Symmetry: D2
Subunit: 474 residues, 4 copies
């Protein structure tokens, strides 16, 4: 049972729009919308979406394996050794949000301050004392974007496992000698940095040049979660305001995906005429080039929706029914929709290019979609006694200042983490929070395992957060 | 009664080193050390300081007025109009941490997300509806460092008032016409940006070229808080670890200031031989060039302590008794003191160049000195019933979703803010926190009105913070 | 009769290696090597080549038309209008070395100081008075590389004609309105800059992604000049020193092209065993990435000559027989060949990425191959009486300072230029020299219509230039 | 007899404005204007000047020594050793235009291609074979502006000698050890780069902060050449067009200098009322910030000619009688004077910031003032038999290809060079031209030892250059 299974199970249930069942449905955790900063729903005039992993949620682990397999074949096709074809994607290993260190070839899990929580070389997990030889402060400067790459996305999931697979292979293949910053193969030296780049490159290639999008569109039921509730919600959003799409993907892909997502013998409610996905949107924009989209942007173009190709030149006309946009900026959306930032709830999955940047750069309200969260919640409520026991040992160890406690703490931590996978929870490693966690609280006003949980709150709802107080203020 | 008075009153009391009186002294707020992230004092091996507004706390408002007067004379000396000499520094107006907008010439108080809390043009406070003509989202991109300058420091206090003084003068002088981005004087157009730069420049000039440092050193009792408790604390720090200084200031100034700060007929305790300020330090470093200091740094030089001038060339020798350093980097301190980041508690007052950067870039533990805080605390504990009434009206207005409340909220907010000054608290405007507040919590592990509050905790103390939990985790 | 015909006619003649016939052959202009700076051939220890338009000279106009046709189809394939398919490459229009002005959409011919010689909008040649509305000083800042693109190469020939074709089409198509900086198509505005970029992009695409290289290799006799004299010369070069190749092209293409160029039933002389093209080289280097090659370079890789693919990682071994290199730098060639700059005569065709940069950045001796020059010479010696008449009218107009002369000067100039084409000589427009001319003199020590003219000088030859004197020095 | 003596001797003679004596005066070399590119004087509508070393020519070696002495005292004042005070400026050593190599601490004389002509370490002249250990190709990349500083100006003359003085001192002082890239002083290491920077800095300091300008203005007869012919020429320039000034210097200095230069009991001709220097100018501009002046420039300000200080803000009014400008750009001059580039003859002395940049960036016509040239000419016409003998030995050595010649060539070269000084001619080292020479020909249309030689040509004069031909074109 993966996280995408949990979502598709909730996707298969019709929507019960009784005002009481709604209140009762969103009492269970898996249908709640969690609040990091207070949000008056009546002040939202525009609802924004990205597509990939928001409207279209890719079924795990089928889609990650397909991304892995395609990437492995691309590397082999440029001269990586054949053994890579013996690799197989293992969803139990990678947790989203790790930091790969191109200098020493380590996958690292870190907190909001760049403190090392977990270090693994290949599939070898390094313990506290042994990491200090390369990380003498148990600390990394995340700002050093030349050395450290953060695997923020679910697209990064297959490369996350791959980078481990690769380090482990070369470490243990006798044709290579291991060195501190890479592998020596007689007279070729492959640094972890160039090995990293090759992977990064081959992932890019399978999305933009290879067959990933092709093989996806030929089996959408296998790879894409469908939910008849999705047209319902969007329809209701259009009743109280405006709805727009701003995806990085291209209109041909966006047309294929969006058509499938709306492929039902009915419209928003069962029994209504079916409507084309574009009619649920007031403004459609593709090739968004996020995060550059929230700054200067790119040139605003117009799609020829028959040919799928862009019209030549810069588009200077107004927002029309039917028109589809390419490029532009976040200001394009504000100007054409007559909106201000805090009028806009922008629903997305990218913690950086969607959520952080629209908040910092524009003042947009944010809703963060976390696919895995559907499985993350399950593990949490089942294992809450372990975390409660952990909270207990911390408090007791704090009283002790008036030694076997510290070793029991590291043990219940280890056991709790493993329930989430080899790399542990998305949001923490024991009692210590992650960089990812920290970002979700700081930048995502609302968050959930799917934005469909918004169907279950009335449109007048005041999401409430607790006010933050400084130490001296309590 | 200013904040510097509160400190100098606590500075004049001898230290009562009984283990009970200590516990009892640090129960009152004004002597507590507040904790944002847990800190084991036994893990600190090195204590770091800056000087200005940390070891040497400049008496308010005497020092701000001297900085103001000198700056006003410098502007007049390059052809600003004479009326500036009629200005007089008013400590009730400026609050540290404001953002000056060089485009529209407004002083702005903003929160962690760049939300406008207070906007003032000159001395004219703009209300909510009227700000939206220049700030259509009530929002500024703080990242636009070409348009927005944040007045982080107490050195920025006199220019903060000056920029208002200036806008107000030109607005109301009939020789000028007001325009949106500056003032037109017949055929000269002075933009708020160039007016800003001139000020910024004249502040720099009085510190580095003018007579500010001179006039300070000729009346140190008037301008610098002295506390016989300061040698005590440093001595105790040297008993359990190493102590270092890293100031941006120059050795001649640092020698004058530091000598005064240690000018007592005794050493650390009354009755002990007096020691020279340098002997309380394991490593002294001047011309630190923070924040560049925590990155690549500058070249490490050696001071000729007799002449006050630097020796020629790059210093390549080891840490010696007596030697004084110039430039270098934070790695210089680690290497010479044999320390790792989390071994170091670095005590400073600059929220950016001291605290934020040593944490993000190095993994240093941080203690933030907030001078004004001594007065900020006083206003808070006296007016806690106003804030409690505010907290009450927010909760009640939240229940109301089952209109005169919203106008009473803005009224008790206004009254509370004014008690702090015309620009309100350092840390908030009503129930909404500031950018500054947000940074103190995020980057300063410990904070206080003076680092001398550390004298009152034993050296084994485990400062404790509450663990942070995500919404779904409670 | 094009220039490539003149070369292929000389290529078809066997080499007569009698010491007298050599001296007599290189007396005619078409077989001379012209000298801009003195060059002792005995001091050359290494001979360097690029490939495209040096070893492999592409037959005109067949190859330019194929590049044009392919480029036109690529633009149509991204939504340019169909009429482009009615275009046909016209070799009489473009002269290499023009400057396209992306602001006003003009092809421009300019001198060493950026003085306008010829301005054409589409196919409309603007006369002196009319250009001053956009060029008020008859001058362009060639340094403004954002506005001006110099069409240096023979690869740029088809886009040179295309950019004219395009401007002329849109100017005169009624579906568009002409404006100063581009064309308005209802609500799309196509600037000359974006139209330029699209072309630049589609040229890049046909070389690197399209079928140009494919269609070339399937008809090498149609598209590539072959000369049995080429192995002879290279063999003799290897007898007195070392010979190397450094091409931007890829090893698969370089293998196909180079094999054809050496495809003869004999080796260097008729009757000798045939040798494989690689054996004529001491060091082979592909993917050179010139001009970046003469600075920091790229990473040195090693080609797997069986698969055509690069080996993975950085190559750290020595120069071996058989090895082929990828990337690297000019220092790679010096180090492996044990050479200094002035030991190296580097033979190439790119006035910038080959010749200028190897001279300025490294101190290499340079030989510039100018394909067109074979036709340029023919026009010059036939029309020398026109140029002599021009020289005469200038001198006479200079004496006149003690008006129909100035109009006769512009008339004989016009007539002379046209003999070279619609855009005139590569090297001049009348008595005024071009930017290109100026660069050849300043940066190319030797130059010729083909480097094969070097076969006709003994290996001890001291090429001689006249010493340059300053005015006051004569 | 220095070069400034030759000028001041010509400055002391009244102007004989008979049309015959003029023709006869400019037949001698020392009063000719030499032509690098043809120039119709009737097409000049605006005459431009800088001031320092053009209108005001500083008397040698008095002014260089004063610059040296002041600079030496400034270095001593920041802790350089006392022995520097034993240095004394020696005008026989430095030639303008050398390249100092901050890596190996060598003064170098180089040609247009960065070929080493002369290398001196301190005062030790390195011969051909010995330079190849640091310069293996006898070649430097002049583009590497981090390593190489070109001493273009006469202001650079005293530092040129100083850098030698310094290297020689430290090399031979026993308190220091010499190393490849600097000097080790126990535990301080002074690199030639930092030693260079210190000098560069101390030269800047004496001009802008020290007493150089002060001590100049208190003895203008000692330090500044005065010529009553200067008002004459400018007056005649104003009769046929417009005259402007654009100096980097400040208005207070420019007022002091310019007043002295016009201090005569008469105006342009003897017997005319004296006029104030400003009235000879249509547009005066100070703080020009060349070469940035010929690009984007700085903000246009207006000087308060009574106070010497700038008015506050940006000046937006028109060109008025009496107004003085500060900053701006070259476009400011064109717009206010209604001129195009080729309308403007700009007379200056800086080969880069004046001449090269106004030509490349704007299309200005250029006149280059070369102070030293008055002495350079004298040495040349006296020693023409040595150069003729040199030209002879080169030709003979070229015939010899059908060994004591090559050693006689290096000997007559050495003897010829020394007549110019220890570093030889400005324009050559033997038969090989310098980088400086090359630039004068390429960028200065006209040049002379003083622009006063323009008085001797009528205003209709067509300066003539020989047309340049490519090898194949003769």
């Amino acid at each position: 049972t993966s996280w995408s299974d949990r979502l598709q199970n909730a996707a298969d249930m019709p929507a019960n729009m009784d005002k009481h069942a709604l209140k009762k449905y969103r009492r269970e955790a898996y249908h709640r919308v969690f609040v990091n900063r207070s949000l008056a729903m009546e002040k939202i005039k525009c609802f924004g979406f990205n597509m990939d992993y928001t409207l279209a949620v890719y079924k795990s682990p089928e889609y990650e394996s397909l991304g892995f397999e395609l990437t492995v074949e691309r590397l082999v096709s440029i001269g990586y050794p054949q053994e890579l074809l013996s690799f197989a994607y293992d969803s139990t290993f990678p947790t989203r949000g790790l930091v790969f260190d191109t200098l020493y070839g380590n996958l690292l899990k870190v907190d909001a301050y760049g403190n090392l929580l977990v270090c693994a070389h290949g599939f070898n997990f390094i313990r506290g004392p042994e990491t200090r030889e390369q990380y003498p402060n148990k600390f990394i400067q995340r700002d050093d974007t030349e050395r450290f790459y953060i695997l923020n996305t679910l697209f990064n999931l297959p490369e996350t496992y791959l980078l481990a697979c690769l380090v482990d292979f070369f470490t243990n293949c006798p044709r290579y000698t291991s060195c501190e910053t890479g592998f020596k193969d007689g007279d070729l030296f492959m640094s972890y940095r160039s090995m990293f780049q090759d992977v990064r490159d081959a992932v890019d290639w399978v999305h933009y040049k290879g067959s990933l999008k092709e093989k996806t569109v030929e089996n959408l039921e296998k790879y894409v979660v469908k939910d008849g509730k999705l047209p319902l919600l969007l329809s209701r959003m259009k009743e109280v305001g405006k709805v727009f799409l701003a995806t990085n993907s291209d209109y041909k892909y966006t047309d294929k995906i969006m058509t499938y997502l709306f492929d039902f013998p009915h419209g928003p409610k069962p029994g209504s005429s079916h409507r084309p996905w574009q009619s649920y949107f007031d403004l459609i924009l593709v090739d968004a080039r996020k995060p550059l989209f929230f700054g200067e942007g790119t040139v605003l173009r117009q799609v020829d929706t028959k040919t799928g190709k862009l019209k030549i030149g810069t588009y200077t006309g107004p927002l029309q029914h039917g028109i589809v946009y390419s490029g532009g900026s976040s200001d394009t959306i504000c100007d054409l929709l007559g909106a201000k930032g805090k009028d806009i709830l922008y629903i997305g999955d990218h913690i950086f290019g969607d959520i952080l940047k629209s908040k910092k750069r524009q003042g947009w309200r944010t809703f963060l979609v976390i696919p895995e969260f559907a499985q993350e919640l399950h593990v949490w409520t089942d294992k809450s006694s372990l975390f409660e026991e952990l909270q207990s040992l911390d408090i007791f160890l704090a009283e002790l200042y008036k030694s076997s406690i510290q070793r029991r703490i590291k043990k219940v931590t280890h056991d709790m983490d493993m329930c989430y996978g080899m790399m542990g929870s998305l949001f923490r490693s024991g009692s210590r929070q992650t960089l990812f966690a920290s970002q979700v609280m700081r930048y995502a006003d609302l968050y959930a395992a799917s934005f469909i949980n918004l169907l279950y709150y009335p449109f007048s709802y005041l999401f409430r957060a607790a006010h933050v107080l400084m130490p001296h203020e309590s």
